[PDB]
């Protein structure tokens, strides 16, 4: 129908969409539509209408998006750019679509989708379309200052993972590596700022927000990471916006996890190099809280019993940290230190108190008064005349560790043992047995190593070393077994040079003296633990050391004697050796001995 009918309709102010349908512009294919010359006339109509309608923006776009949805329109316009005679229209249409979107406050997700930001994944930031997408967001907010502002962030989260925290993890990763490259760094900072603003405007607490930064990792690992500082930066930002709800890290941590788990984590973190520094800092702050709450050490114990570490309170490490709080507490309350320990004393069993006091002696503020009561209690126990076994346990000597031989209590306990043993000649007790039982073989072994290294303990350590070997005699440990017990199997080529080798020889002798019926030679002991070819590799090596040369030669002979006892043929030996150090020397010698025997 005619331009006249159009002008009539324009005077009548007919809606664009109706005119479209009047024109039968219901083409079967959207990509075809723009090729019809009729469509262009309708555009002109729609524009001219818009000039006197209420809406500025392109009714065309409104119409088309309402039929087909935003992406399809945009893609169609992009398809239209191809045919150059449509280019001028297509570029007008693109501009119009943007104007339209901005005017209609269309959701950023639709623009993101329409832009085919489907692709980018890793490389969202450098791509110009993404930049344009941020421009769109800023522009929309600029046109709409009255309304609550719109944000990118939901679109990003919902795309990369279907989980509030989990999606945010990938975003954080992307921000971090974006900052590292100069190229993306500017973009990365804008994205970060938007994410921050999003959290602030949604009023998402630091507590909640932390779960995002923590995602993927153990609690421990998060603290070691860069992300920790990033979350502190959030906390500080949160406090700035909402100072009535201000919170510090430790306070926040406390309310999230509770003091017990926090403490456990601070323990864990204090052990490891990456975290150690701040573990201690945060620990001190946790103490400062309890101090500001005026909680006595026993009050603190009350608090913390009621979830995690009561069963695992008295053991290492938890105890040590408790004692650390005690140290601080008395630094603020020197007056009541006596009263404190006294209350511990009536509340708990003596052995528990002893366990405390051992640790307390490490801390200068406590050392004196701790030492006093330690001795007062000990003296009482000595006066009782009870069994050394019992007394040992009450003194918590089982929990001193490797350096027990330095420990004043242990020495006092020995003195009691000797007195007791004289006074109970029918019912004597063994110091060594107590040590053996309580610290187990491997602990005894470390204790010896430690006590040897300190000259003050050295003589005592030798006594213990003797007693351990005496125990080996009493249990009839075979020298073969003793060799492995002293890890001589590890010493390699240098076994004869090993100091402990000599000790093992001397044990083997002593064993033979106690048990002549099952008497065993050094060479048999060596043969039990290793085969000939390793042994003569060790002997050929040992001949190079003057201190062991003679020994090596004696053992070469002793080995040869065993071949004779074993009635081995030189051919068997020659066959089984190949390219072996000292083999021919030893063969020729064995051959010579065989000749003399024959």
């Amino acid at each position: 129908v005619t331009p006249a009918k159009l002008q009539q309709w324009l005077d009548e102010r007919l809606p664009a969409g109706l005119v479209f349908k009047n024109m039968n512009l219901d083409e079967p294919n959207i990509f075809s539509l723009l090729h019809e010359p009729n469509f262009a006339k309708w555009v002109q109509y729609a524009d001219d209408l818009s000039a006197k309608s209420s809406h500025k923006e392109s009714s065309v776009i409104s119409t088309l998006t309402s039929l087909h949805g935003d992406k399809v329109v945009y893609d169609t316009i992009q398809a239209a750019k191809l045919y150059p005679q449509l280019s001028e229209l297509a570029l007008k249409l693109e501009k119009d679509q943007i104007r339209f979107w901005i005017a209609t406050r269309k959701d950023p997700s639709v623009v993101f989708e329409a832009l085919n930001l489907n692709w980018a994944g890793i490389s969202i930031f450098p791509k110009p379309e993404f930049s344009a997408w941020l421009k769109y967001v800023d522009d929309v907010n600029a046109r709409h200052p009255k309304e609550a502002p719109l944000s990118i962030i939901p679109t990003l989260k919902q795309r990369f993972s279907r989980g509030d925290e989990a999606g945010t993890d990938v975003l954080l990763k992307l921000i971090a590596n974006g900052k590292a490259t100069t190229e993306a760094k500017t973009v990365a900072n804008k994205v970060e700022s938007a994410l921050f603003d999003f959290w602030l405007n949604s009023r998402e607490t630091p507590d909640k927000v932390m779960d995002a930064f923590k995602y993927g990792t153990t609690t421990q690992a998060f603290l070691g990471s860069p992300r920790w500082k990033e979350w502190e930066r959030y906390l500080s930002a949160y406090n700035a916006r909402y100072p009535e709800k201000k919170a510090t890290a430790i306070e926040t941590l406390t309310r999230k996890y509770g003091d017990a788990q926090l403490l456990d984590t601070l323990i864990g973190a204090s052990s490891k190099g990456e975290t150690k520094t701040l573990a201690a800092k945060l620990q001190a702050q946790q103490f400062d809280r309890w101090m500001n709450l005026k909680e006595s050490p026993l009050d603190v114990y009350n608090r913390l019993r009621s979830s995690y570490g009561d069963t695992a309170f008295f053991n290492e490490p938890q105890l040590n940290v408790w004692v650390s709080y005690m140290n601080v507490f008395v630094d603020k309350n020197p007056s009541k230190v006596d009263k404190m320990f006294l209350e511990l004393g009536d509340t708990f069993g003596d052995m528990r108190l002893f366990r405390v006091l051992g640790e307390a002696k490490k801390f200068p503020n406590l050392e004196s008064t701790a030492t006093k009561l330690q001795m007062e209690k000990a003296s009482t126990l000595f006066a009782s005349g009870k069994s050394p076994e019992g007394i040992f346990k009450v003194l918590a000597l089982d929990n001193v560790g490797d350096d027990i031989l330095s420990n004043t209590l242990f020495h006092k306990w020995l003195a009691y043992l000797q007195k007791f043993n004289k006074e109970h000649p029918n019912n004597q007790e063994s110091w060594f047995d107590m040590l053996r039982i309580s610290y187990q073989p491997f602990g005894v072994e470390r204790i010896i190593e430690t006590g040897r290294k300190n000259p003050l303990t050295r003589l005592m350590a030798e006594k213990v070393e003797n007693a351990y070997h005496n125990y080996w005699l009493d249990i009839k440990m075979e020298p073969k077994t003793a060799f492995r017990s002293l890890h001589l199997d590890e010493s390699g080529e240098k076994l004869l040079a090993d100091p402990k080798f000599n000790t093992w020889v001397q044990y083997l002798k002593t064993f033979n003296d106690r048990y002549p019926n099952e008497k065993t030679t050094v060479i048999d002991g060596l043969r039990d633990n290793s085969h000939d070819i390793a042994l003569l590799r060790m002997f050929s090596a040992a001949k190079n050391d003057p201190s062991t040369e003679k020994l090596a030669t004696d053992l070469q002979s002793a080995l040869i004697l065993k071949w004779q006892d074993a009635k081995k043929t030189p051919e068997e030996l020659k066959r089984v050796f190949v390219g072996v150090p000292a083999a021919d020397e030893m063969l020729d010698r064995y051959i010579k001995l065989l000749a003399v025997a024959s």
């Binding site: 102010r13 007919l14 809606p15 664009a16 969409g17 109706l18 349908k21 219901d26 209408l49 309608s53 209420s54 809406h55 923006e57 392109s58 009714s59 776009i61 409104s62 119409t63 998006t65 309402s66 039929l67 087909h68 949805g69 209609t104």
Partner: protein
């Protein structure tokens, strides 16, 4: 005449509301109150469609003209018992949930906007109170 505009503006062929067309309709309703009568009468008919999509489009148009155009249209809307039909949509045993939500929000908006029982079109409040008696909540 005007019915064509309404029908096309509420055609099942649209995926979404043609907001520009809706505004264009608002403009002519501000020019010609006679045509405005016909518009609201058309909307009632299209609300009568089974198709929830059509219903939503009609509701959305209606929202638009109500906010944009003058007191004549408000009078028509009340006087043509359009509101009663809207109530009746909610009264269905299994209504469409989006439709239901839309009508509820609209009627709540309007009865507030017009001043409730002392509204010069108290029909809005009347419809809202009927809803309340059935125990609807926005």
């Amino acid at each position: 005449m005007v019915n064509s505009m309404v029908e096309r503006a509420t055609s099942d062929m649209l995926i979404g509301p043609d907001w520009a067309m809706n505004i264009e309709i608002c403009d002519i309703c501000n020019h010609d109150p006679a045509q405005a009568k016909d518009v609201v009468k058309g909307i009632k008919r299209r609300l009568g469609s089974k198709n929830p999509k059509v219903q939503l489009l009609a509701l959305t148009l209606l929202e638009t003209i109500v906010k944009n155009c003058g007191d004549i249209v408000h009078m028509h809307v009340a006087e043509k018992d359009l509101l009663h039909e809207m109530v009746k949509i909610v009264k269905k045993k299994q209504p469409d949930l989006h439709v239901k939500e839309k009508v509820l929000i609209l009627i709540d908006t309007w009865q507030e906007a017009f001043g409730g029982p002392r509204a010069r079109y108290p029909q809005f409040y009347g419809a809202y109170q009927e809803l309340l008696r059935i125990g609807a909540v926005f």
